Amino acid sequence: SNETETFRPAGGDMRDNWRSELYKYKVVKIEPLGVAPTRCKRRVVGRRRRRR
Amino acid sequence: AENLWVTVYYGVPVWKEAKTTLFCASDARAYEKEVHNVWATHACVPTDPSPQELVLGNVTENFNMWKNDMVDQMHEDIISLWDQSLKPCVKLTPLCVTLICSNATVKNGTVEEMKNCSFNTTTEIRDKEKKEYALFYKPDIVPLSETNNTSEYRLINCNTSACTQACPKVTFEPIPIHYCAPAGYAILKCNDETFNGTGPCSNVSTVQCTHGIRPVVSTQLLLNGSLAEKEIVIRSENLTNNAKIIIVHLHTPVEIVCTRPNNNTRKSVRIGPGQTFYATGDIIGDIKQAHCNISEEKWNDTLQKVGIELQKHFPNKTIKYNQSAGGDMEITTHSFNCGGEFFYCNTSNLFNGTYNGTYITITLQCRIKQIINMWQGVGRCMYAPPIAGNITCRSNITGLLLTRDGGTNSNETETFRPAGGDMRDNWRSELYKYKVVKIEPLGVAPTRCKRRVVGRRRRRR
Amino acid sequence: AVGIGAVFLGFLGAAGSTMGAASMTLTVQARNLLSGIVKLTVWGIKQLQARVLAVERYLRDQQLLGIWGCSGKLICCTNVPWNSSWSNRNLSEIWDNMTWLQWDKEISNYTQIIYGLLEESQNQQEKNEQDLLALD
Amino acid sequence: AVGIGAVFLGFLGAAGSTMGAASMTLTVQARNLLSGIVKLTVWGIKQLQARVLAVERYLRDQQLLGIWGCSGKLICCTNVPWNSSWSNRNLSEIWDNMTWLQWDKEISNYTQIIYGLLEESQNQQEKNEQDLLALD
Amino acid sequence: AVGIGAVFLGFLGAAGSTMGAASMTLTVQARNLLSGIVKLTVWGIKQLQARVLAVERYLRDQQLLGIWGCSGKLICCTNVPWNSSWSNRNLSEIWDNMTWLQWDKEISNYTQIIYGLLEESQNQQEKNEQDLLALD
């Protein structure tokens, strides 16, 4: 009947017990990425360099 | 002469001989079926579409198939995989009971291949037992001694060792398997089609993994193998040494088409709590006995082709073939597995007749077993449960195993007979192209360069 | 072959080529040695047996570069004069013929001896790491 | 964040900070990736399953820096010109806006292509490692 | 003892010798930390348990050098002024007496504090390896 709805208990699968507590989390692998451009310039003959 | 200084080059392409524990990789999505297989792991998952190849120009490397380090690796791998899959399955200790056996009658007839045996078996409760019966489709059940009664028999396991069932879940399949060496090691391959088994190979190439070698097990004839490229090839350690084994590779295959035409019905026996014993209960069709057919035209051509090829090594001696000299049932008859049944085929005419090589339907009666002292030859006993319905086989014979009778024969004749019994010689016929060499990125080599003067930077040279 | 994109099975044709041509694309081997193509059963334990040795061999090679002063460099000059007893002093003419696979056979006995000199070469520098200059 | 002693859970909030500011305190991740927090039973084998992969992942990252000529440096310039097709040539105006977590989606397809160019930068050094200057 | 090749059990007499003498032949310990002398049973699992820990220990020592700016150097001076609270500013007179085995007892509490400064020392370069200078 369109004005009523019936709800009953359930169970039998243990994963749904623990899925109620282990739901806040994720596991993500930390990957230092690819490149990112800068205003730098080609290193000249193996010389060291400070800022840039 | 010239002034030269040391220079280090870690990164160089040079290798050295070594042996390594090789990872397995299976072809295509068969790893998804491999989880339920034995002779295939649980499971050999690949990571890339293997095997890729590169030809190494101007490289010559020394090969040897008889001292190969991979054949010993896979044989100790397959039999170890054989034990693990069979370990959790039901043991057949409680069936060793004094069986009362009689003729196995069928619809308007009787079958000479088997006995109708009855025995007391334990029910769910241990203090009560019930009568039960089953058709052990082999007369290979030892009559019980110390009695004049001819109708008391006994299952041949318990004289030497108890056995384990092969669970219905796992399947005996020759799934192709690739061996992938780990990082730091590289698998070479000899492309020289004329390679006789030892010596230099002047056409080498490197691969990620071996080709799709499948773990088939049989005796006296190599089934579903990889064929030779150009012509028939014969490989042995030293042909003059009448010991060892003469492995032949066929140019093209002769199809062995055969079957188990009886219509058997599987029956479940309840030997214990949660333990079920499967046996052939009854026959629900006409009886015609197992047999195998081979093309007379194509096979007789094979002996003519093989005969002259052997005669190249044995000049001016007519090649004669003949039946096996002796041994167990596993090596005096062509033995193989097909569809879950273990055949033992008599080779009714795959032995006969002189064949000079100068050019101057064969039916095989086949027996079947359930208990197998497995083809390793010494170890685990296994009970193969029956397979309901007919069985049919269609396999490509690709190589013959032979051995020779020495040594005071008439100087114009030489007799050859089949062989077998050792698993390694089956797989040594397919795993013979490869080596495993550790890559050693080398160091010092003098150059025109000069010393590093007061730590100053330098790139060029 | 010359080129660096390539594949590990793209450069190893230099195993027969000249040492000069093999000296380029020297990085592709350094990439391949790291990881390559790699219930409990045989292959599961093999993935721990083989993997740990693949890492172990790589560290032993980078261990020697980090001491000789050739850290991070594929090619590297060292302050050691080449003794003529190890080989004739005309390899600069010869290595256009030999491949690296053939050069190794000559220095097979002398390689462990030479590593002492390269260690000594660094310790011409290490003997000079306490005395005078680096007040700065 | 300014300050580099800190904790791995002291700097990672830079994941939402500006891409320029996140370049500071870059050493803490290099420290954290090594070991971190880590009869026979499940946890015992896990300390071999996870531990060995943590090592091998670290080696794979470092050897790329070694080949490219950025050994031992957190920041590192390279001799490769930035092709405008990969991204617009105005990121200097933008890394104050984007975070490092957002920059990655710009170059997801191009990262494997770019590593070839960084290698190609090294053959500008590998070409200049046989010819003239080392007589100095 | 003075030398390089020697044996790992050829130089460890420096455990009692002076710090100055112990600073020579310093590569032999760095070589030993990796290799050493290393059906399934007790020893088989130990060759995975102990072997992986030896590698795991080795990478921590090298990564700390890789961050401090001392990569690949057995001796490395850094930009951190010596605070007299850690120890008196006259050890130059003293380290001809003490051995390295005795030096650690002085700085046992201060070692973890000092590593922060060495990070900060590199972070002077990290702040100074961004932005403007290197037109080269």
Side-chain angles (χ1 to χ4, degrees), chain D residues 97-120:
Chain D
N97 291 341
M98 290 188 180
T99 180
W100 261 107
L101 178 58
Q102 284 167 333
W103 160 252
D104 188 46
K105 293 199 283 274
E106 292 271 318
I107 56 166
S108 306
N109 302 303
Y110 314 127
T111 294
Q112 179 52 236
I113 294 163
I114 289 157
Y115 291 179
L117 273 295
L118 280 79
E119 296 284 334
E120 290 269 23

PDB file of all heavy atoms in Angstrom, chain D residues 97-120:
ATOM      1  N   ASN D  97      48.456  29.122  -7.150  1.00  0.00           N
ATOM      2  CA  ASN D  97      47.047  28.740  -7.074  1.00  0.00           C
ATOM      3  C   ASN D  97      46.871  27.232  -6.938  1.00  0.00           C
ATOM      4  O   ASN D  97      46.273  26.757  -5.967  1.00  0.00           O
ATOM      5  CB  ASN D  97      46.300  29.241  -8.319  1.00  0.00           C
ATOM      6  CG  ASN D  97      46.170  30.749  -8.357  1.00  0.00           C
ATOM      7  OD1 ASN D  97      46.313  31.424  -7.338  1.00  0.00           O
ATOM      8  ND2 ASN D  97      45.891  31.287  -9.538  1.00  0.00           N
ATOM      9  N   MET D  98      47.383  26.467  -7.898  1.00  0.00           N
ATOM     10  CA  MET D  98      47.239  25.020  -7.856  1.00  0.00           C
ATOM     11  C   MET D  98      48.019  24.432  -6.689  1.00  0.00           C
ATOM     12  O   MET D  98      49.031  24.982  -6.248  1.00  0.00           O
ATOM     13  CB  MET D  98      47.736  24.390  -9.156  1.00  0.00           C
ATOM     14  CG  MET D  98      46.874  24.660 -10.371  1.00  0.00           C
ATOM     15  SD  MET D  98      47.413  23.680 -11.786  1.00  0.00           S
ATOM     16  CE  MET D  98      46.247  24.202 -13.039  1.00  0.00           C
ATOM     17  N   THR D  99      47.525  23.307  -6.183  1.00  0.00           N
ATOM     18  CA  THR D  99      48.286  22.458  -5.280  1.00  0.00           C
ATOM     19  C   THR D  99      48.912  21.320  -6.077  1.00  0.00           C
ATOM     20  O   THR D  99      48.512  21.033  -7.208  1.00  0.00           O
ATOM     21  CB  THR D  99      47.409  21.902  -4.147  1.00  0.00           C
ATOM     22  OG1 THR D  99      48.209  21.082  -3.286  1.00  0.00           O
ATOM     23  CG2 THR D  99      46.235  21.068  -4.664  1.00  0.00           C
ATOM     24  N   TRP D 100      49.923  20.682  -5.480  1.00  0.00           N
ATOM     25  CA  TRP D 100      50.583  19.569  -6.155  1.00  0.00           C
ATOM     26  C   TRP D 100      49.602  18.449  -6.468  1.00  0.00           C
ATOM     27  O   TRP D 100      49.732  17.778  -7.498  1.00  0.00           O
ATOM     28  CB  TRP D 100      51.734  19.029  -5.304  1.00  0.00           C
ATOM     29  CG  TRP D 100      53.080  19.540  -5.713  1.00  0.00           C
ATOM     30  CD1 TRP D 100      53.850  20.446  -5.048  1.00  0.00           C
ATOM     31  CD2 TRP D 100      53.817  19.172  -6.885  1.00  0.00           C
ATOM     32  NE1 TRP D 100      55.021  20.665  -5.732  1.00  0.00           N
ATOM     33  CE2 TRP D 100      55.024  19.894  -6.863  1.00  0.00           C
ATOM     34  CE3 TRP D 100      53.572  18.303  -7.950  1.00  0.00           C
ATOM     35  CZ2 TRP D 100      55.982  19.773  -7.862  1.00  0.00           C
ATOM     36  CZ3 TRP D 100      54.524  18.183  -8.939  1.00  0.00           C
ATOM     37  CH2 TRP D 100      55.714  18.914  -8.888  1.00  0.00           C
ATOM     38  N   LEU D 101      48.610  18.241  -5.599  1.00  0.00           N
ATOM     39  CA  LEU D 101      47.595  17.223  -5.849  1.00  0.00           C
ATOM     40  C   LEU D 101      46.783  17.525  -7.105  1.00  0.00           C
ATOM     41  O   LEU D 101      46.259  16.600  -7.738  1.00  0.00           O
ATOM     42  CB  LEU D 101      46.676  17.110  -4.631  1.00  0.00           C
ATOM     43  CG  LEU D 101      45.504  16.130  -4.687  1.00  0.00           C
ATOM     44  CD1 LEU D 101      45.971  14.714  -4.950  1.00  0.00           C
ATOM     45  CD2 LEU D 101      44.733  16.199  -3.384  1.00  0.00           C
ATOM     46  N   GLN D 102      46.668  18.801  -7.481  1.00  0.00           N
ATOM     47  CA  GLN D 102      45.903  19.196  -8.657  1.00  0.00           C
ATOM     48  C   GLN D 102      46.754  19.276  -9.915  1.00  0.00           C
ATOM     49  O   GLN D 102      46.216  19.153 -11.022  1.00  0.00           O
ATOM     50  CB  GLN D 102      45.235  20.553  -8.424  1.00  0.00           C
ATOM     51  CG  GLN D 102      44.014  20.499  -7.517  1.00  0.00           C
ATOM     52  CD  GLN D 102      43.559  21.873  -7.058  1.00  0.00           C
ATOM     53  OE1 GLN D 102      44.351  22.812  -6.979  1.00  0.00           O
ATOM     54  NE2 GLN D 102      42.274  21.995  -6.753  1.00  0.00           N
ATOM     55  N   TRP D 103      48.065  19.487  -9.779  1.00  0.00           N
ATOM     56  CA  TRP D 103      48.913  19.607 -10.960  1.00  0.00           C
ATOM     57  C   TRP D 103      49.007  18.286 -11.714  1.00  0.00           C
ATOM     58  O   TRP D 103      49.185  18.276 -12.938  1.00  0.00           O
ATOM     59  CB  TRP D 103      50.311  20.088 -10.563  1.00  0.00           C
ATOM     60  CG  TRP D 103      51.347  19.779 -11.599  1.00  0.00           C
ATOM     61  CD1 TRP D 103      52.336  18.844 -11.518  1.00  0.00           C
ATOM     62  CD2 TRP D 103      51.480  20.391 -12.887  1.00  0.00           C
ATOM     63  NE1 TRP D 103      53.081  18.841 -12.671  1.00  0.00           N
ATOM     64  CE2 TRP D 103      52.575  19.783 -13.527  1.00  0.00           C
ATOM     65  CE3 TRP D 103      50.781  21.398 -13.557  1.00  0.00           C
ATOM     66  CZ2 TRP D 103      52.989  20.147 -14.806  1.00  0.00           C
ATOM     67  CZ3 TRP D 103      51.194  21.759 -14.827  1.00  0.00           C
ATOM     68  CH2 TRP D 103      52.287  21.136 -15.437  1.00  0.00           C
ATOM     69  N   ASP D 104      48.872  17.161 -11.005  1.00  0.00           N
ATOM     70  CA  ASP D 104      49.143  15.861 -11.610  1.00  0.00           C
ATOM     71  C   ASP D 104      48.210  15.572 -12.777  1.00  0.00           C
ATOM     72  O   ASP D 104      48.634  15.019 -13.799  1.00  0.00           O
ATOM     73  CB  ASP D 104      49.013  14.760 -10.565  1.00  0.00           C
ATOM     74  CG  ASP D 104      49.472  13.420 -11.085  1.00  0.00           C
ATOM     75  OD1 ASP D 104      50.555  13.359 -11.706  1.00  0.00           O
ATOM     76  OD2 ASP D 104      48.749  12.425 -10.882  1.00  0.00           O
ATOM     77  N   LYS D 105      46.936  15.940 -12.649  1.00  0.00           N
ATOM     78  CA  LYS D 105      45.970  15.658 -13.701  1.00  0.00           C
ATOM     79  C   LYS D 105      46.260  16.413 -14.992  1.00  0.00           C
ATOM     80  O   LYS D 105      45.697  16.058 -16.033  1.00  0.00           O
ATOM     81  CB  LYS D 105      44.563  15.982 -13.199  1.00  0.00           C
ATOM     82  CG  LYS D 105      44.098  15.047 -12.085  1.00  0.00           C
ATOM     83  CD  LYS D 105      42.588  15.055 -11.901  1.00  0.00           C
ATOM     84  CE  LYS D 105      42.120  16.296 -11.159  1.00  0.00           C
ATOM     85  NZ  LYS D 105      42.191  16.114  -9.682  1.00  0.00           N
ATOM     86  N   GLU D 106      47.118  17.434 -14.956  1.00  0.00           N
ATOM     87  CA  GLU D 106      47.511  18.110 -16.186  1.00  0.00           C
ATOM     88  C   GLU D 106      48.371  17.216 -17.071  1.00  0.00           C
ATOM     89  O   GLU D 106      48.248  17.268 -18.300  1.00  0.00           O
ATOM     90  CB  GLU D 106      48.271  19.396 -15.858  1.00  0.00           C
ATOM     91  CG  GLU D 106      47.425  20.486 -15.203  1.00  0.00           C
ATOM     92  CD  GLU D 106      46.752  21.411 -16.201  1.00  0.00           C
ATOM     93  OE1 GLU D 106      47.402  21.812 -17.190  1.00  0.00           O
ATOM     94  OE2 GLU D 106      45.568  21.745 -15.991  1.00  0.00           O
ATOM     95  N   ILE D 107      49.230  16.386 -16.470  1.00  0.00           N
ATOM     96  CA  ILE D 107      50.272  15.663 -17.196  1.00  0.00           C
ATOM     97  C   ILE D 107      50.134  14.155 -17.013  1.00  0.00           C
ATOM     98  O   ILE D 107      51.134  13.428 -17.044  1.00  0.00           O
ATOM     99  CB  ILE D 107      51.671  16.140 -16.750  1.00  0.00           C
ATOM    100  CG1 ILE D 107      51.856  15.992 -15.230  1.00  0.00           C
ATOM    101  CG2 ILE D 107      51.887  17.590 -17.162  1.00  0.00           C
ATOM    102  CD1 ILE D 107      53.293  16.128 -14.772  1.00  0.00           C
ATOM    103  N   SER D 108      48.906  13.670 -16.818  1.00  0.00           N
ATOM    104  CA  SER D 108      48.708  12.240 -16.598  1.00  0.00           C
ATOM    105  C   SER D 108      49.140  11.426 -17.812  1.00  0.00           C
ATOM    106  O   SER D 108      49.836  10.414 -17.683  1.00  0.00           O
ATOM    107  CB  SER D 108      47.242  11.961 -16.262  1.00  0.00           C
ATOM    108  OG  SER D 108      46.810  12.753 -15.174  1.00  0.00           O
ATOM    109  N   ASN D 109      48.737  11.861 -19.007  1.00  0.00           N
ATOM    110  CA  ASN D 109      49.088  11.126 -20.217  1.00  0.00           C
ATOM    111  C   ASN D 109      50.536  11.377 -20.621  1.00  0.00           C
ATOM    112  O   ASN D 109      51.182  10.501 -21.209  1.00  0.00           O
ATOM    113  CB  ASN D 109      48.146  11.515 -21.355  1.00  0.00           C
ATOM    114  CG  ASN D 109      46.688  11.265 -21.017  1.00  0.00           C
ATOM    115  OD1 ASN D 109      46.299  10.145 -20.684  1.00  0.00           O
ATOM    116  ND2 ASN D 109      45.870  12.309 -21.104  1.00  0.00           N
ATOM    117  N   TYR D 110      51.063  12.564 -20.314  1.00  0.00           N
ATOM    118  CA  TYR D 110      52.350  12.990 -20.852  1.00  0.00           C
ATOM    119  C   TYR D 110      53.538  12.584 -19.988  1.00  0.00           C
ATOM    120  O   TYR D 110      54.680  12.769 -20.420  1.00  0.00           O
ATOM    121  CB  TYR D 110      52.358  14.511 -21.022  1.00  0.00           C
ATOM    122  CG  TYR D 110      51.110  15.061 -21.675  1.00  0.00           C
ATOM    123  CD1 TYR D 110      50.386  16.081 -21.076  1.00  0.00           C
ATOM    124  CD2 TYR D 110      50.656  14.560 -22.887  1.00  0.00           C
ATOM    125  CE1 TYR D 110      49.244  16.588 -21.665  1.00  0.00           C
ATOM    126  CE2 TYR D 110      49.515  15.062 -23.485  1.00  0.00           C
ATOM    127  CZ  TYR D 110      48.814  16.076 -22.868  1.00  0.00           C
ATOM    128  OH  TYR D 110      47.677  16.582 -23.457  1.00  0.00           O
ATOM    129  N   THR D 111      53.307  12.044 -18.788  1.00  0.00           N
ATOM    130  CA  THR D 111      54.412  11.791 -17.865  1.00  0.00           C
ATOM    131  C   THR D 111      55.368  10.742 -18.418  1.00  0.00           C
ATOM    132  O   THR D 111      56.591  10.910 -18.356  1.00  0.00           O
ATOM    133  CB  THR D 111      53.872  11.359 -16.502  1.00  0.00           C
ATOM    134  OG1 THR D 111      53.149  12.443 -15.908  1.00  0.00           O
ATOM    135  CG2 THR D 111      55.012  10.959 -15.575  1.00  0.00           C
ATOM    136  N   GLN D 112      54.833   9.649 -18.961  1.00  0.00           N
ATOM    137  CA  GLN D 112      55.700   8.618 -19.518  1.00  0.00           C
ATOM    138  C   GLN D 112      56.421   9.093 -20.770  1.00  0.00           C
ATOM    139  O   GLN D 112      57.530   8.623 -21.046  1.00  0.00           O
ATOM    140  CB  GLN D 112      54.891   7.354 -19.821  1.00  0.00           C
ATOM    141  CG  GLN D 112      55.691   6.200 -20.438  1.00  0.00           C
ATOM    142  CD  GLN D 112      56.937   5.843 -19.649  1.00  0.00           C
ATOM    143  OE1 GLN D 112      58.045   5.853 -20.182  1.00  0.00           O
ATOM    144  NE2 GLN D 112      56.759   5.524 -18.372  1.00  0.00           N
ATOM    145  N   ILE D 113      55.819  10.000 -21.536  1.00  0.00           N
ATOM    146  CA  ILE D 113      56.500  10.562 -22.698  1.00  0.00           C
ATOM    147  C   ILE D 113      57.638  11.470 -22.250  1.00  0.00           C
ATOM    148  O   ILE D 113      58.721  11.479 -22.846  1.00  0.00           O
ATOM    149  CB  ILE D 113      55.499  11.310 -23.598  1.00  0.00           C
ATOM    150  CG1 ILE D 113      54.492  10.331 -24.217  1.00  0.00           C
ATOM    151  CG2 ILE D 113      56.242  12.088 -24.689  1.00  0.00           C
ATOM    152  CD1 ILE D 113      53.243  10.992 -24.775  1.00  0.00           C
ATOM    153  N   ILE D 114      57.407  12.247 -21.189  1.00  0.00           N
ATOM    154  CA  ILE D 114      58.390  13.235 -20.754  1.00  0.00           C
ATOM    155  C   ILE D 114      59.646  12.552 -20.227  1.00  0.00           C
ATOM    156  O   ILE D 114      60.758  13.062 -20.397  1.00  0.00           O
ATOM    157  CB  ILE D 114      57.770  14.176 -19.704  1.00  0.00           C
ATOM    158  CG1 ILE D 114      56.746  15.106 -20.358  1.00  0.00           C
ATOM    159  CG2 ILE D 114      58.842  15.010 -19.038  1.00  0.00           C
ATOM    160  CD1 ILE D 114      55.718  15.665 -19.393  1.00  0.00           C
ATOM    161  N   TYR D 115      59.491  11.396 -19.569  1.00  0.00           N
ATOM    162  CA  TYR D 115      60.656  10.685 -19.043  1.00  0.00           C
ATOM    163  C   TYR D 115      61.632  10.311 -20.149  1.00  0.00           C
ATOM    164  O   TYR D 115      62.837  10.207 -19.899  1.00  0.00           O
ATOM    165  CB  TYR D 115      60.228   9.423 -18.288  1.00  0.00           C
ATOM    166  CG  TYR D 115      59.488   9.628 -16.971  1.00  0.00           C
ATOM    167  CD1 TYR D 115      59.041   8.535 -16.242  1.00  0.00           C
ATOM    168  CD2 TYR D 115      59.241  10.897 -16.454  1.00  0.00           C
ATOM    169  CE1 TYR D 115      58.371   8.697 -15.046  1.00  0.00           C
ATOM    170  CE2 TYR D 115      58.571  11.065 -15.259  1.00  0.00           C
ATOM    171  CZ  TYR D 115      58.139   9.963 -14.561  1.00  0.00           C
ATOM    172  OH  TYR D 115      57.471  10.129 -13.371  1.00  0.00           O
ATOM    173  N   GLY D 116      61.141  10.103 -21.370  1.00  0.00           N
ATOM    174  CA  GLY D 116      62.049   9.909 -22.486  1.00  0.00           C
ATOM    175  C   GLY D 116      62.912  11.130 -22.740  1.00  0.00           C
ATOM    176  O   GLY D 116      64.115  11.014 -22.986  1.00  0.00           O
ATOM    177  N   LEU D 117      62.311  12.321 -22.676  1.00  0.00           N
ATOM    178  CA  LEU D 117      63.071  13.544 -22.904  1.00  0.00           C
ATOM    179  C   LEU D 117      64.110  13.777 -21.814  1.00  0.00           C
ATOM    180  O   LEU D 117      65.221  14.231 -22.110  1.00  0.00           O
ATOM    181  CB  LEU D 117      62.129  14.744 -22.996  1.00  0.00           C
ATOM    182  CG  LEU D 117      61.526  15.088 -24.362  1.00  0.00           C
ATOM    183  CD1 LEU D 117      62.597  15.530 -25.354  1.00  0.00           C
ATOM    184  CD2 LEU D 117      60.736  13.916 -24.919  1.00  0.00           C
ATOM    185  N   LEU D 118      63.771  13.494 -20.552  1.00  0.00           N
ATOM    186  CA  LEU D 118      64.756  13.622 -19.483  1.00  0.00           C
ATOM    187  C   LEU D 118      65.920  12.669 -19.697  1.00  0.00           C
ATOM    188  O   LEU D 118      67.071  13.028 -19.431  1.00  0.00           O
ATOM    189  CB  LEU D 118      64.111  13.362 -18.123  1.00  0.00           C
ATOM    190  CG  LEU D 118      63.335  14.534 -17.518  1.00  0.00           C
ATOM    191  CD1 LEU D 118      61.976  14.658 -18.161  1.00  0.00           C
ATOM    192  CD2 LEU D 118      63.191  14.378 -16.020  1.00  0.00           C
ATOM    193  N   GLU D 119      65.639  11.453 -20.166  1.00  0.00           N
ATOM    194  CA  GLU D 119      66.709  10.560 -20.589  1.00  0.00           C
ATOM    195  C   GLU D 119      67.483  11.163 -21.756  1.00  0.00           C
ATOM    196  O   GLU D 119      68.717  11.091 -21.800  1.00  0.00           O
ATOM    197  CB  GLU D 119      66.132   9.198 -20.976  1.00  0.00           C
ATOM    198  CG  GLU D 119      65.479   8.428 -19.834  1.00  0.00           C
ATOM    199  CD  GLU D 119      66.477   7.784 -18.894  1.00  0.00           C
ATOM    200  OE1 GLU D 119      67.610   7.484 -19.324  1.00  0.00           O
ATOM    201  OE2 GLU D 119      66.113   7.564 -17.719  1.00  0.00           O
ATOM    202  N   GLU D 120      66.767  11.751 -22.723  1.00  0.00           N
ATOM    203  CA  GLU D 120      67.420  12.353 -23.885  1.00  0.00           C
ATOM    204  C   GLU D 120      68.337  13.492 -23.470  1.00  0.00           C
ATOM    205  O   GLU D 120      69.339  13.770 -24.137  1.00  0.00           O
ATOM    206  CB  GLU D 120      66.373  12.846 -24.884  1.00  0.00           C
ATOM    207  CG  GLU D 120      65.626  11.727 -25.599  1.00  0.00           C
ATOM    208  CD  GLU D 120      66.286  11.307 -26.900  1.00  0.00           C
ATOM    209  OE1 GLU D 120      67.504  11.534 -27.058  1.00  0.00           O
ATOM    210  OE2 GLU D 120      65.582  10.750 -27.767  1.00  0.00           O
TER     211      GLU D 120
END
